[PDB]
Design a protein around this nucleic acid. Structure first.
Ligand SMILES: [Mg+2]
Lengths: 229, 230, 83, 209, 50, 228
RNA sequence: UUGAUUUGGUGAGAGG
């Protein structure tokens, strides 16, 4: 924020969304996975030689389906002090607090398109992706044993033709990352005796798109399809 | 009918990107008409090449991260969306960027072909930190106009492409800023004439007299519907 | 085309009977058998009904006269077909 | 199960949940005429599924009903002409969620919108008490033929130009337009063309332009 | 201090710049206010409400 | 990289001096380009001829009054400005009208040469109360383009004209009003296009499509230099 | 004859 109050620093540090350095010093910066900070000797314990390895929480789900993501804001071989920030969280910029973005605004009526409280926006705002936010949705699929045997995780999806077996493996469950939309299939999860077979296979909700960023499976001790487990 | 015709008299290049151009002589009152018309056309409808599909090895989706780099993959796709390329012969080319070693990855490290010209040799893309890290991306540069985004280009694409090719939005227009001024012309016998000083700001890839010629042809072929038919 | 029904309200002066007369007429055109008394500009049966009302050729009396005429035509058809 | 705010009278018999209905955020769209409102293409193809099915079965493009539901599930290139031919003279009931008086349900004609927001003509906003700070409105479709005629002949937005509480007009121009008029019809003691004489209002606008 | 900072930059002191119109190419009368406001995108998105 | 050419779909001819050129479809943000360019050319650049100066007996400046007439000389100046004349061969023709008798004076009452003619003879000039009143005016017609008013005309002139000469606004361009809208048309996939609706009302001496075609070829010949 | 479960109810927070 170009016009802030200076309390952005204290809010962005004190809320634990940024990776504030515990012990000061330099840096090794492997960072693809973790910031590695070599500690100066005065803040460093006699035993436990010790260099601090900070875990960056990459793209994951918040409680409001927004994206909490940390990005390193220090380079390689650069001094940092105790209490300094290292990784900028969501809505932070070099340790400050950046909720929205600063844009060139004219105050005028423009042909009625900003009548009561409406707001008229150029195309330069939407070309630059300078509000293009990232939402993350968790979707569960379970194959509980309601009645008439247990349900099953197989691609051999019925009635529906080669419009089931597609964003999945050669024989079950959404593969990894494509541009899935609405009406797709993510986890083939249907039982026989439920012709009389049916389609409970958890699909993608109507109207949403996206990229499968992660697939977790601590399933009923047996999930392995072929021999992947 | 005592009208005249204008010509491009002096074309000064203030830099490689920001460059003005005069127009002389214009008739009385025509200055703001031609200036506003050439502004609207030169901001909407110019052809320029841009990055469309980026193909990194060993990277599935764009929200992952990679071994040995600074910018994350969304940062790399944004810094590639800002790229400024100038092809000559073809309308769809594939470049290659391969680099290992500690240090930043400029745009000058792309192994160019003969008919592609990368006009920004200080455009940064990555910051390789590990000396055992490598990066091998294969960019695809189409050519069009306007703004065509990833959502609409999610089903529009006919040529069945394989999965693993990250789709970058297409900012095709190489004109970013244009202003015109109607001065007083220095005509030795007329005082009621004016000049048009168009001050372009390009992406470096477009030639300003060529841009003005193309915008003039667009305006003339649009007005031929008024001229010929009624 | 249609924006306001004000003349149709003038010629059937109740504003609540306009809906009923035009609904009876638009059911005579929709299912309906009948063809309109007015040129159609790719308007639907609603606007063609109200557009017939505005020029003063459909009201409740004309529709009851036409249905008595069709009842007499069916009567004469039954009598002249059987006897 | 009988008494209270959530019994059968106040929750299921006086007020019911309703098919052929939709809901979205409103926005302005000042190009509209005041008998028509903007309505998105996605909501229009969802609210008018049976009319599109009937139109598709009339032409002969498909056969069974299933085929038509696959066609609009895929959204091919021919159903948008079908949609512009089911919209044309078919009013819809726009409704802002706290309806207090009868001017809070008004019937418009749809104009299709590339977008996902109901474009609502600005003057009509002063009837709905609708600003544009995040408001939402519901659309309802008059199915039968008597209901289309009631939407056109009683509930159309051209028919509600006076508030029923009094004699005052409810399509009064609200805020931007009175500033445009107050700046337009005013005067200053010296300007360009002070005290010149003009042969009509047409060359008055020609001298202004 | 806002006026003095607007004098350090080469901007007009009133905060208001004359603006032309992109449609007609001609000046808006009575100069308008242009500046930078920090605008936020709230999580009431329209394709969660439609 | 190919652009959408339109078809001129409608000339709704309301009257002989009225038109509405419905026109569709154009690229997004091109209707305003074509409309504004044609509007500025048709307002302030289209060539034509009308009355500029008039010398009348009995008056000495623009605020005097001759006898025998209901209206005053500001009204005769305004009704003179409303007259639409066309000159074929030359470009500076002086005309003279003389009228006596009970009745109004119309445009057909004027004395005309072989090169000039009146496009509306029943256009009124004045009315006459006295049968002994003999009105006389020396109507000069130049030929320019667009619009020049009498205010900047008297600011620009410096030579001392004889007393009795009257300045009037020179409505050289033959159009009276042009004002367009841009609506939104639809080609079957892209809804982002836009349709032009140009309205035009002129005086006599021309047909609105002829004025549109004249402005379009003026701009095309203006831009004819640096094209491919 | 070609397929399926929240409403139910509580609590908390939010929009107009
Ligand atoms: Mg509000």
């Amino acid at each position: 924020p170009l016009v802030g109050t200076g309390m952005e620093r204290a809010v962005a540090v004190d809320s634990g969304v940024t990776a504030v350095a515990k012990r000061g010093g330099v840096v090794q910066y492997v960072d693809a996975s973790r910031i590695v900070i070599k500690v100066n000797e005065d803040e460093m314990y006699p035993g436990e030689a010790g260099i601090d390895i900070y875990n960056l929480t990459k793209y994951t789900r918040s409680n409001q389906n927004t994206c909490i993501n940390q990005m390193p804001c220090v380079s390689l071989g650069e001094p940092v002090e105790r209490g300094d920030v290292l990784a900028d969280g969501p809505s932070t910029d070099l340790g400050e607090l950046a909720l929205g973005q600063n844009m060139r605004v004219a105050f005028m009526p423009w042909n009625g398109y900003n009548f009561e409280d409406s707001i008229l926006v150029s195309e330069r705002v939407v070309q630059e992706d300078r509000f293009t936010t990232i939402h993350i949705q968790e979707l569960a699929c379970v194959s509980r044993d309601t009645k008439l045997g247990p349900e099953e995780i197989t691609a051999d999806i019925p009635n529906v033709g080669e419009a089931a077996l597609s964003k999945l493996d050669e024989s079950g469950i959404v593969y990894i990352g494509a541009e899935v939309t609405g009406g797709d299939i993510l986890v083939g999860k249907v039982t026989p005796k439920g012709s009389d077979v049916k389609d409970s296979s958890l699909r993608v909700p109507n109207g949403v798109s996206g990229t499968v960023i992660d697939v977790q499976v601590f399933t009923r001790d047996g999930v392995e399809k072929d021999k992947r487990a | 009918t005592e009208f005249l015709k204008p010509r491009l008299v002096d074309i000064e290049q203030v830099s490689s990107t920001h460059a003005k151009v005069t127009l002389e002589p214009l008739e009385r009152g025509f200055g703001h008409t031609l200036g506003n018309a050439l502004r609207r056309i030169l901001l909407s409808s110019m052809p320029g090449c841009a990055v469309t599909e980026v193909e990194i090895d060993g990277v599935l989706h764009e929200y992952s991260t990679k071994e040995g780099v600074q910018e994350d993959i969304l940062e790399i796709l944004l810094n590639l969306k800002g790229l400024a390329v100038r092809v000559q012969g073809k309308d769809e080319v594939i470049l290659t960027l391969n680099k290992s070693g500690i240090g930043p990855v400029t745009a000058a490290d792309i192994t160019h072909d003969g008919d592609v010209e990368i006009v920004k040799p200080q455009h940064v893309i990555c910051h390789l930190t590990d000396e055992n890290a490598s990066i091998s991306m294969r960019i695809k540069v189409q050519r069009g106009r306007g703004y065509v985004p990833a959502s609409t280009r999610i089903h529009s694409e006919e040529d069945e492409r394989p999965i693993g090719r990250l789709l970058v939005d297409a900012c095709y227009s190489p004109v970013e800023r244009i202003a015109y001024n109607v001065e007083a012309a220095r005509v030795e016998q007329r005082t009621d004439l004016d000049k048009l000083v168009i001050e372009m700001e390009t992406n470096g890839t477009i030639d300003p007299e060529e841009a003005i010629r193309r915008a003039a042809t667009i305006l003339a072929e649009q007005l031929e519907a008024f001229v010929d038919l009624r | 085309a249609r924006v306001t029904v004000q003349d149709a309200v003038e010629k059937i002066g109740n504003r609540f009977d306009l809906v009923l007369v035009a609904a009876r007429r638009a059911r005579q055109m929709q299912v309906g058998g009948k063809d309109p008394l007015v040129p159609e500009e790719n308007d639907k049966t609603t606007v063609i009904a109200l557009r017939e009302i505005e020029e003063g050729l459909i009201n409740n009396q004309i529709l009851d006269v036409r249905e008595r005429q069709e009842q007499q035509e069916q009567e004469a058809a039954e009598l002249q077909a059987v006897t | 199960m009988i008494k209270g705010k959530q019994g059968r009278f106040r929750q299921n018999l006086l007020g019911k949940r309703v098919d052929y209905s939709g809901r979205s955020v409103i926005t302005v769209g000042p190009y509209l005429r005041l008998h028509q409102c903007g309505l998105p293409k996605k909501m229009a193809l969802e609210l008018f599924k049976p009319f599109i099915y009937g139109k598709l079965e009339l032409r002969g493009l498909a056969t069974t009903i299933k085929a038509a539901k696959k066609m609009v599930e895929r959204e091919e290139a021919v159903v948008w002409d079908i949609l512009d031919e089911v919209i044309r003279e078919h009013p819809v009931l726009l409704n802002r969620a706290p309806t207090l008086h009868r001017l809070g349900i008004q019937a418009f004609e749809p104009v299709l919108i590339e977008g996902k927001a109901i474009q609502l003509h600005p003057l009509v906003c002063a009837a709905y008490n609708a600003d544009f700070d995040g408001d939402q409105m519901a659309v309802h479709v008059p199915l039968t033929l008597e209901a289309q005629l009631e939407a056109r002949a009683l509930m159309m937005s051209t028919n509600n130009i006076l508030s029923p509480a009094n004699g005052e007009p409810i399509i009064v121009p609200s805020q931007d337009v009175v500033l445009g008029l107050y700046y337009m019809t005013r005067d200053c003691v010296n300007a360009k063309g002070e005290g010149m004489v003009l042969t009509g209002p047409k060359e008055a606008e020609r001298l202004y332009r | 201090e806002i006026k003095e900072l607007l004098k350090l930059g080469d901007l007009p002191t009133s905060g208001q710049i004359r603006l032309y119109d992109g449609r007609t190419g001609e000046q808006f009368e009575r100069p308008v206010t242009v500046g930078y406001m920090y605008m936020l995108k709230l999580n009431h998105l329209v394709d969660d409400k439609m």
